[PDB]
Ligand binder design. Structure first.
Ligand code: CA
Ligand code: CA
Length: 110
């Protein structure tokens, strides 16, 4: 869609920097720095739809290793530790996959 128009490029610029590490994943802080939780639920839809590269409606480990490339360039490959923890923390639901409504509220739980 446009992770720039919908959210804010300036908020994105901080957000990518909050995951720009090996294993130091900080989803609550990312979703606040990117202002995700401060945009609409239907915007949070188009958000997830940019990370879901394959359009299947579910993020799993193949996408989850470089998920940031839906937020923006200079995303990089996340650590194996990060991927492992992100999968387990991100799936609030027991599918082993991140879905939008979880992912939105994931970070309000923090
Ligand atoms: Ca997918
Ligand atoms: Ca789920």
């Amino acid at each position: 869609m446009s992770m720039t128009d919908l959210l804010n490029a300036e908020d994105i610029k901080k957000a990518v920097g909050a995951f720009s590490a090996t294993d130091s994943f900080d989803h609550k802080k990312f979703f606040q720095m990117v202002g995700l939780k401060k945009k609409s639920a239907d915007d949070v839809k188009k958000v997830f739809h940019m990370l879901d590269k394959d359009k299947s409606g579910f993020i799993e480990e193949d996408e989850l290793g470089f998920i940031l490339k839906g937020f923006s360039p200079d995303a990089r490959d996340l650590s194996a530790k990060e991927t492992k923890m992100l999968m387990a923390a991100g799936d609030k639901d027991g599918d082993g996959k991140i879905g939008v409504d979880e992912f939105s509220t994931l970070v309000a739980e923090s």
